[PDB]
Amino acid sequence: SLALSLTADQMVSALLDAEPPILYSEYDPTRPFSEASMMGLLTNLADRELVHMINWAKRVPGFVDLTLHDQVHLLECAWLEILMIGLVWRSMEHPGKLLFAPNLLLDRNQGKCVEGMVEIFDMLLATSSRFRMMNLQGEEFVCLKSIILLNSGVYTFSTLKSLEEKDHIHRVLDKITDTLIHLMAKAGLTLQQQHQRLAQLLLILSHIRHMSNKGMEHLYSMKCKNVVPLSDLLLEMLDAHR
Amino acid sequence: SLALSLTADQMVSALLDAEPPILYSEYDPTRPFSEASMMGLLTNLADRELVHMINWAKRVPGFVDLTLHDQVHLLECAWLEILMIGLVWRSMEHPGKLLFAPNLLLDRNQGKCVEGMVEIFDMLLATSSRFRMMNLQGEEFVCLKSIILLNSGVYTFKDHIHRVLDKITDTLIHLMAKAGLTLQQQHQRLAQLLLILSHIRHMSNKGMEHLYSMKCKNVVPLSDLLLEMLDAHR
Amino acid sequence: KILHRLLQDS
Amino acid sequence: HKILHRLLQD
Ligand SMILES: O=S1(=O)CC(c2ccc(O)cc2)=C(c2ccc(O)cc2)C1
Ligand SMILES: O=S1(=O)CC(c2ccc(O)cc2)=C(c2ccc(O)cc2)C1
Numbered sequence: 001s002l003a004l005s006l007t008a009d010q011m012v013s014a015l016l017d018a019e020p021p022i023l024y025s026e027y028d029p030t031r032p033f034s035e036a037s038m039m040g041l042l043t044n045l046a047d048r049e050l051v052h053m054i055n056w057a058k059r060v061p062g063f064v065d066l067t068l069h070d071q072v073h074l075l076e077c078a079w080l081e082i083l084m085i086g087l088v089w090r091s092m093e094h095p096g097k098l099l100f101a102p103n104l105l106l107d108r109n110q111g112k113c114v115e116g117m118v119e120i121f122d123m124l125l126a127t128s129s130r131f132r133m134m135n136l137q138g139e140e141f142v143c144l145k146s147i148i149l150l151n152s153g154v155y156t157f158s159t160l161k162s163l164e165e166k167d168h169i170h171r172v173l174d175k176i177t178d179t180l181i182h183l184m185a186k187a188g189l190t191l192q193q194q195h196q197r198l199a200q201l202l203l204i205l206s207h208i209r210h211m212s213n214k215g216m217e218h219l220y221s222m223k224c225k226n227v228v229p230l231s232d233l234l235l236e237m238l239d240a241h242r
Numbered sequence: 243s244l245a246l247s248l249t250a251d252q253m254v255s256a257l258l259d260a261e262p263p264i265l266y267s268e269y270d271p272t273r274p275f276s277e278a279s280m281m282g283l284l285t286n287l288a289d290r291e292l293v294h295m296i297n298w299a300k301r302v303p304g305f306v307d308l309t310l311h312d313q314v315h316l317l318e319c320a321w322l323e324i325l326m327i328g329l330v331w332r333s334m335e336h337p338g339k340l341l342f343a344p345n346l347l348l349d350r351n352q353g354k355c356v357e358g359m360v361e362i363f364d365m366l367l368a369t370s371s372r373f374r375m376m377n378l379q380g381e382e383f384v385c386l387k388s389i390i391l392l393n394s395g396v397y398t399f400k401d402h403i404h405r406v407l408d409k410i411t412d413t414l415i416h417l418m419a420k421a422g423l424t425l426q427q428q429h430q431r432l433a434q435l436l437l438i439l440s441h442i443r444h445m446s447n448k449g450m451e452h453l454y455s456m457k458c459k460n461v462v463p464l465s466d467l468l469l470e471m472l473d474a475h476r
Numbered sequence: 477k478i479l480h481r482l483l484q485d486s
Numbered sequence: 487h488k489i490l491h492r493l494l495q496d
Contacts, residue, residue: 076479194429
């Protein structure tokens with residue numbers, strides 16, 4: 001298809017070109033935050049980011065080739081992982097802080113305004129500290145983010161033709177793997193340093209999955225508690241994870 | 243450190259030598275299963291498996307080098323992942339079935355005997371078919387399991403753990419090179435294996451909340467060791 | 477299904 | 487986390 005014939009530098013350029021924008025929040029520094037107000041800004045922010053992510057997913061090489069129900073499944077399972085790694089990525093050059101928006105840069109002390117948030121806050125910070133220590137590159141970021149979209153839901157899909165579409169997902173994933181190796185070779189990394197860094201990057205996705213699962217329970221805790229109003233799309237993505 | 247010194251073949255043999263044994267289920271409730279009897283068999287089995295896992299971890303190269311608090315943190319974070327990847331591994335040549343014990347082989351219909359269990363059952367069977375589809379080797383399996391132990395709790399703290407993690411990467415690549423796979427085939431299979439760990443973590447989180455439900459539902463009393471491991475995820 | 481709608485936008 | 491302490495020290 002389109003993604004299979006695509007080269008490494010063309011894979012990178014397609015992903016780099018499909019990046020969603022950085023959005024601003026309605027945050028007013030004149031007033032101090034509360035649990036309801038802070039959680040209202042983050043929920044409003046994620047809801048708007050969700051819209052851009054869905055159209056970003058449509059531009060990931062291979063995602064169009066899938067059926068609409070398979071596209072829904074991957075996004076239903078990966079949406080918070082993708083929001084989180086994007087948050088971690090743009091927070092990379094702000095140690096000890098999470099850049100939710102250019103006008104919203106929070107400490108872990110401010111994250112205490114929301115119950116249970118500080119645990120997920122520290123996990124997001126440690127991941128961003130890990131990206132900084134690894135000096136993660138933007139070309140590697142877009143590859144990892146596309147891997148999350150294609151991988152996080154592929155093990156919850158029994159036709160042989162079902163197999164054919166699933167084997168297509170593994171075919172695109174193998175291509176993105178080749179693209180990551182292609183990038184590391186250009187940076188002057190030895191073959192040993194290439195496999196090692198590839199392992200380090202993919203092992204972070206395990207922790208990102210963990211953050212998303214812990215984050216999924218935190219959002220479901222506030223849907224029933226009704227502490228902050230959740231948008232219609234977010235409540236729909238939340239019921240996918242039950 | 244002592245784990246960075248030995249070679250890849252030496253690393254594989256040290257991991258294969260430390261493999262815990264396959265334990266048997268209790269033959270006492272060997273009748274057809276209710277929700278309480280099945281949960282009692284798996285709780286008892288998992289509790290006894292935990293004891294062997296803790297001693298298996300001490301034989302993981304580089305694990306003893308860590309402090310006791312660091313050993314406690316890694317085992318607290320990974321114990322259900324490690325139990326699950328072991329269950330998936332020994333269920334490989336039993337497609338459509340999960341071999342909890344040699345005398346306790348179950349399919350997804352029997353998993354429905356417990357509330358909320360069939361969902362975790364299907365994710366476990368899906369992991370087993372993936373290992374079978376990939377033809378996962380025992381030397382690869384012991385590498386993934388050690389990676390889970392050292393990696394799952396490392397970002398909740400360090401530099402020595404990553405060096406041992408890099409060593410198991412070198413060991414994984416060494417195994418695939420012996421199998422004749424090309425360079426492109428080596429870093430694609432490395433990627434495919436490590437991406438499964440993301441799904442095994444997902445199963446652990448879904449399993450963790452499921453074991454918390456039946457703790458509160460109190461379908462079966464949990465051992466003090468299992469309670470302490472479950473409380474670490476709260 | 478809002479996700480199904482947003483995905484099926486031409 | 488005390489039982490895990492004992493088993494790790496035998
Ligand atoms: O886990 S969080 O605290 C972080 C986070 C988030 C992550 C990225 C965003 O762009 C916006 C929000 C969260 C979020 C919050 C509400 C929501 O509906 C979706 C994600 C929660
Ligand atoms: O998530 S489970 O259903 C799977 C599982 C398990 C997994 C592997 C084992 O060797 C033993 C038990 C479970 C287990 C069950 C009871 C328990 O007390 C601890 C783990 C639960």
